[PDB]
Design a protein around this ligand. Sequence first.
Ligand SMILES: OC[C@H]1O[C@@H](O[C@H]2[C@H](O)[C@@H](O)[C@H](O)O[C@@H]2CO)[C@H](O)[C@@H](O)[C@H]1O
Length: 148
Amino acid sequence: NLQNIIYNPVIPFVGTIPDQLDPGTLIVIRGHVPSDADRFQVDLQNGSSMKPRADVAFHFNPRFKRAGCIVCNTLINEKWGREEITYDTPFKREKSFEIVIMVLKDKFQVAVNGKHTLLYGHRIGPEKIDTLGIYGKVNIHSIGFSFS
Ligand SMILES: OC[C@H]1O[C@@H](O[C@H]2[C@H](O)[C@@H](O)[C@H](O)O[C@@H]2CO)[C@H](O)[C@@H](O)[C@H]1O
């Protein structure tokens, strides 16, 4: 029901994903937003190069300034694509969360605390994703996977 679990990773976190993100796969991320957070992000990456920066198939980016939002996008050859902004965000400073990223055939389906949050259509085949990055102001209790 959950495997390859990593606990209290240091942020910034970069880790290799154990198996392939095929339709049906869940990525489960539990954490807490620090009282002073501006933003954090979960990036599903093709590799871990820093310079040049690895491509990001799915960038999921809660932001806390202003009214708060989540920005999602894809990074290819160090250039961002079209931004998808979700203004109804469940994240709050000083509150804990369970993010479930469900890989479907045509998109990611993301829920927080069991409530649907957003959809993100695949722009790169998810089979090419091999690295998970978590950056910014966030505390992560655990990262787990359930494949297929
Ligand atoms: O698209 C994700 C990417 O956005 C960058 O910031 C954008 C911003 O989100 C956009 O709404 C604003 O109007 O212009 C900025 C130009 O880049 C971030 O810098 C980056 O880290 C990603 O989050």
